[PDB]
Symmetry: D2
Subunit: 503 residues, 4 copies
């Protein structure tokens, strides 16, 4: 393919073969067993780019005890909001001081284009900064009007020990969307990144240490899903599990956590529509459609995976979309020109292709792609577009998590809302229209937590994120995330004595 950029396994940066340790109670540690996991660069076949411990259940429980002691006995929850804030600002500063190093790690472990990784690192420094600024102003309420003899207080307090589990598609970003709100709320944390992508999360805990946030406030453990996931969800000393990843894994940890009334925060998958009306800015919308589906090679929960297009502009929109799709640079994650990088693993690329196969067998019309590219060099899947998709097809309903767009048409705004909502998911949606009523009413009527008008993907630390329906529980970011990691205590204070019950 003309737009494919082949990698160069001779890149000097591939010779750095970083080895990492877990960080538990301030100390960098191996697994008791000494076992390790290697990460092979998905963009560069056979090139080992990271190794970290494979934790046992007991290794993870030690991380929990460190977080527990840090919360029960340590200074962190006792400090002022301002003191907590100053330390978190130092982490934000260190993230920028190490931007190049951190972006390289993400690119190599995830297969993320390096330019995209570099931008994500800077956005993470901004997340830490936002949260640091808000951490000191966290408040509760006074009720000075419940009777002269009484005063009502609602006090904000930390939930306690939070286990945070993060996925392979946006490792650093997801840690930075969770950890700062949790510890900023006065919580202590055990972070468990994906077995594929633990490098930047270990570095992040090491930066917090260098900052230096007290021992055991921010711990990181590494390993496969099974030990760590079960442990954090059932350990008595963990007060909350904040999970980000698939519905399948989310619901399992959710069921486990419910056994002991553990608070649960879930950010899960979706099948996000972009609705393009006939009066949209056609060039802006076409570019947004491509961005929505190809960003992170479509390995994105807020991907625009369904394109719902009004009948009258379907042809003009498809033409512009295919043109972008044929020209957009994909391949080598280390090339500064690359816009779309590698699939995370062979099993995942296989999953994506199997949906492309089901699409074809369903009768949907393949317009572009639908095959692996540069198979010898690494894991790459072609930009893929289906037309003629109907709502019943498995490709219109299930989350593919690859660069695969399903196109459906509609005639009226009412039909478009009905199609957008005919999903068990409810994470994201975009509406493209220049019409005040169409844009606002459509967005108001779609059951999705993360919405956009005349845009896609790009958000701000200032606004809350989360899903409706099966795409999640709770709300992160903005001021909302602090409520996720806080308990609220209602206090009825009687000054003097109450009226007696026994007369």
């Amino acid at each position: 393919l003309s737009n494919f950029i082949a990698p160069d396994s001779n890149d000097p940066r591939l010779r750095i073969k970083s080895r990492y340790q877990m960080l538990v109670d301030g100390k960098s540690v191996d697994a008791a067993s000494g076992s390790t996991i290697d990460r092979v660069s998905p963009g560069h076949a056979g090139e080992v780019v990271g190794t970290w411990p494979e934790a046992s259940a007991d290794d993870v429980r030690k991380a929990v005890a460190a977080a527990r002691k840090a919360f029960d006995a340590g200074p962190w929850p006792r400090m002022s909001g301002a003191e907590r804030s100053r330390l978190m600002f130092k982490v934000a500063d260190l993230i920028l001081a190490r931007q190049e190093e951190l972006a390289l790690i993400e690119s190599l472990e995830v297969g993320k284009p390096i330019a995209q990784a570099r931008g994500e690192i800077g956005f993470c420094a901004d997340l830490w900064s936002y949260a640091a600024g808000q951490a000191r102003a966290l408040e509760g309420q006074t009720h000075n009007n419940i009777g002269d003899d009484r005063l009502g207080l609602v006090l904000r307090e930390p939930v306690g020990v939070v286990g945070i589990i993060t996925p392979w598609n946006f490792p650093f970003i997801i840690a930075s969307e969770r950890v700062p709100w949790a510890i900023g709320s006065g919580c202590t944390v055990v972070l468990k990144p994906s077995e594929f992508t633990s490098g930047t999360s270990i570095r992040l805990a090491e930066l917090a240490r260098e900052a230096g946030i007290p021992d055991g406030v921010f711990n990181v453990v590494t390993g496969y899903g099974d030990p760590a996931g079960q442990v954090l969800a059932e350990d008595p000393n963990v007060d909350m599990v904040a999970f980000t990843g698939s519905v399948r894994v989310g619901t399992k940890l959710g069921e486990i956590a419910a056994r002991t009334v553990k608070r649960v925060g879930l950010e899960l998958g979706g099948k996000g529509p972009q609705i393009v009306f006939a009066d949209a800015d056609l060039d802006a919308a076409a570019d947004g459609i491509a961005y929505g589906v190809y960003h992170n090679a479509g390995q994105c929960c807020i991907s625009g995976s369904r394109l719902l297009v009004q009948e009258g502009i379907r042809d003009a929109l498809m033409e512009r979309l295919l043109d972008i799709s044929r020209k957009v640079a994909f391949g080598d994650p280390l090339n500064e020109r690359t816009k779309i990088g590698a699939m995370i693993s062979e099993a995942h690329a296989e999953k994506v292709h199997s949906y492309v196969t089901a699409g074809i067998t369903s009768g949907a019309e393949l317009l572009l792609g639908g095959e692996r590219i540069g198979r010898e060099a690494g894991l790459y899947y072609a930009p893929t577009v289906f037309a003629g998709v109907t709502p019943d097809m498995s490709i219109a309903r299930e989350e593919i998590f690859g660069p695969v767009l399903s196109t459906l048409t509609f005639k009226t705004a009412d039909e478009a809302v009905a199609l957008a909502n005919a999903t068990e998911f409810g994470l994201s949606a975009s509406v493209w229209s220049t019409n005040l009523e169409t844009a606002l009413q459509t967005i108001r009527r779609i059951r999705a937590g993360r919405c956009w008008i005349n845009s896609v993907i790009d958000g701000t630390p200032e606004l809350p994120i989360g899903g409706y329906k099966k795409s999640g529980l709770g709300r992160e970011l903005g001021r909302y995330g602090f409520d996720e990691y806080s308990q609220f205590k209602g206090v009825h204070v009687t000054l003097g004595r109450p009226a007696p019950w026994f007369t």
Copy 2:
């Protein structure tokens, strides 16, 4: 042994003659179960008197109620009405509650075994819960962010959760329905309310009041029956968006587990083992009254009960003396008597469970100072006011929720010890601190891990403030402005006015 503060029930009372029959309310219609099967409620206060009958719903009966709520949410006017419109209808329900206060109070008394004077006050409180919620429902807001770039506007829109299943317990039927329903429907939600098999009368009447007020069909449905199938159905049905459960930790955890299978939102309000901490500098007469109130309110069948007394050494004797004086005199017994302050146990199984905890406390070596037996066995279900002393944290009576009129007393020396003892529980619903000292009262209350706290008071709260638990006592916050967030979804919208900068470049 007969106690002179026991008010014997009168089998003769005319109010027992009325054998009230009730129907479910689904999509505006009063309906029997498909099967025609019913459950009777015998008054716990008055042996053998049936005082209520209602349908035994099947799973399909419940799914039909879910379907009605689903339709009212997806196609009906309720979530598309203005907050003001919803608010006016909810005020009309509040006014109807007041209008029917004596009728409602009598039902609650007969079905729960609640003293009639307490039930009367509760019904008044419920009208107030409805009024508070109605006034707040129209003011519910989200946020604008007008500072995220000239080309962009940030919106956070508040919307309803959708269809909410609400399961309420036997101890405060009308109150808990009034703490949940108005916040859920005020947020634009529609509801299927499932009250306890023992105590469905006032909850059916509440749904009939909403219909009488003009609330659209399917917004507020009520089904009746045993714990299951309703519990399972609400937790598993794909058309239910959220389950709001109030009851035991045991049942709550199980419904939570089921609900998690489909990523269902869950609100839980569960049991506790609430401590009241009395310092040496407390107002002794007020504290002693508060201790009695704390444990005997609702016959101790109360999630926020003061079931543990933690008393500073050496006000111990002076507090105990006052507590025992009150406990000897306080009127318990016949729910229909206006003088009764403490009523009946909900059921024979429950009364045996309470007595089993008492016997366990004895075998543990705790000192029984008062009570510890059934009273008027032939007349109804009554348990004497009971006080244990010399309880140590390891005993089952110090740890487990008894849910009877049974106090466990433990002493401490220092504030720090009081805090450690208070937090030495898997529960965290409620706590009270009694002290005249600024630093002790406030630092102690700040350090206790419980969601519902009191200083120099106990039990009585306000619609204005949030309620909920820490640890195993609950998930989420109800009441005040908080309850509306429990029944809302928040939608974050990034609005580009014009066009974004192109990605392909």
Copy 3:
């Protein structure tokens, strides 16, 4: 000329028989001025009909009212009541407003010259204002700061400002009282209400309804009289904490300067020159109706009037044709007729001033398309619906607030031009944008410097949202949650539990 849309006053209407003598209300008592002097109101719709009389207060009469509010606040129970207690009393007032709706609507119609159907809708809206405020009054909060050191607790307490003097205009007497009084007394304040010399009847009735509801003596007092002495007394008296004035910029600025002499808080809601901007892509029929409504509502005697039409060149003729068709047909005249949409000028002095502006517009070279004279001169005070075209922004009719049914039309080519024209005013009260385009509707409204904005609508607002002006149109915000902050003080408390670190070593 006789217009066929003019409804001539019917002097045989039996409602014109009603004579009404009102008294001031101070410290719970209905009272005359010490002098016995009174002021009559002649109906502006019906020549020679005397429809109300009320006292002409002396400076000393007003100080007595101030002293009653002072006593009510300093010693009486109102500010010490719970929010819930105040709320219940305010809901009773809202209920009374509805119970007396027809009575109140008639008073407003007769005294103001307001069409009876409009007056009736306003009274209903006022009942909703009182209900909204009553709902919110009980939930008012401050903040806790639990994160400023383990040894400290931060509290922000909300408290009432105290005694508030409220001065209201003749154009919307009941509405403005109802947008101010409930927010003030709901905050725990006590008030002295001073309505216009022309229109005191509904305001005295409102104070009488508060008394009837059981609001404590001295919480809500009303005095009547000319602009001064009342205005000067309220703005200079040491026992007044705040003046909330609504009326002309000239009077507000003067009261503002006087009040500043003693650091007295001031809320001002003043006049405007509000534009409606109609873009080529607007819904033309809707925009045309909204233009008519914007300028003719209350006979244009309205601070939020759309007194300037800024219309995009391409649709100027189509919009004008629709606007003039409505303007030829719309019923104006007899305020007592149910068909009337536009009523009387408030006074002969006001009608002359309105005509003075129209004559100035003609001399400036503006094109008179419609109206521009008095109608039914013998029967009452009526001014014809009036439209000017070809208005340029240097003309006195583009710049000054006319306060009659007189529209000034100017054209523009681009949104940027429309914004600059809209903002080329010293005023900043209201503005409307009509457009079907997302970007131009929202970007235009974000760029216009006015506090009360509308898209694709005009005039009609909600109690839920705040109101007030930019620039010379006002100071402060009323309504929604904002009005409570206007009548509250916030007390920041740094609480040290135990001992701070010593300053002296």
Copy 4:
């Protein structure tokens, strides 16, 4: 008096004069006329330590014009919250980087002990940091429940151009309590510091320039009260005046501002009481009373200028207070050991002594101090009166010197009535270990800035301002942003409304 630290005439830092210029539209400039004003350092022999321009009315109008253009046409208000915030954090960093330079200027110009000044500058860096964090999170409301065809928006916008006038007693702190909340809201500013104490304010504007804040966002002009005061209150291009200083000057500016409906924020004087109950921590309270009245030599609006003591701890308290009063190092502002600095001017030092003599002739009991001290420097001895009664001038009027008025009370109810018998309502402290006494007494005092078992020390997190004649509006915390914002209510109809004409 052996607690006096005599000023060292030879300290070299007294010889290092500094000259400053105004800063307008990013440019450092002298007055059009070239005229300047000097400042003599009040703790020392007539040593000139600062000079800055004497502005004309036209100079101030140009500063307003620069702010106006910066707001109407420049990037500042159109920037995201995040972008403004990043620039404000850079100013916070610069303040810390220049801490010692700034502390010395404040010490030299106002007569403030250098250890106090050091802490103050540190605190100002924190004020800027807090404000910078909060600026990006400012929000309005959506009302999504006012009918299916409608959407309510409340949009927060900047008020526009703000004139900020600051006093001689805390020049850097008050600039740092106002400017960051104003520019953080999207506003542009013209700062006018006192003629006595312009040095740190000019440096602050230059730090903002150095940080990269756009030209015209933060301007600083210097000179006497007028013409700057009049111009800021009268210029139609100014949208708001934020004034801090005396009731007398505040009320006059407020009157002028009212003539054109100009928004005004006022932070004025006080007569703050500290209430000490019999159950208070005696040692902490005694130390608190001394702090309260002697901080900044009593030249403080939040001074505990009245002591209200419960009969029966009166004598044990008075003993502790006098012991402290006699040992506390006062004098040379340049000494690291000094706790109490110099008076501001000769005219002010004399005003303080005049109140002291008027307190003597009223019948009050002088227990300590009451004398001017020095020949080279303006100073006043720690002064404690007993037996003061509500009606005496020293009980009613703001002295603004290190002069305590002591009154006794029997009950909490009398303590409250005594605390509230003032036209002021800026601050109050309550000392008690009793839950009900501490909280009910604080709830009943009509004052905006309150303390329990503490005095003086506050946080950026919490709002400040006065009741009664002590001010209008609320600064700091989240409240200060509302002071510099306008709120725009929008009823948005999607599609079309129901027609009026049917």
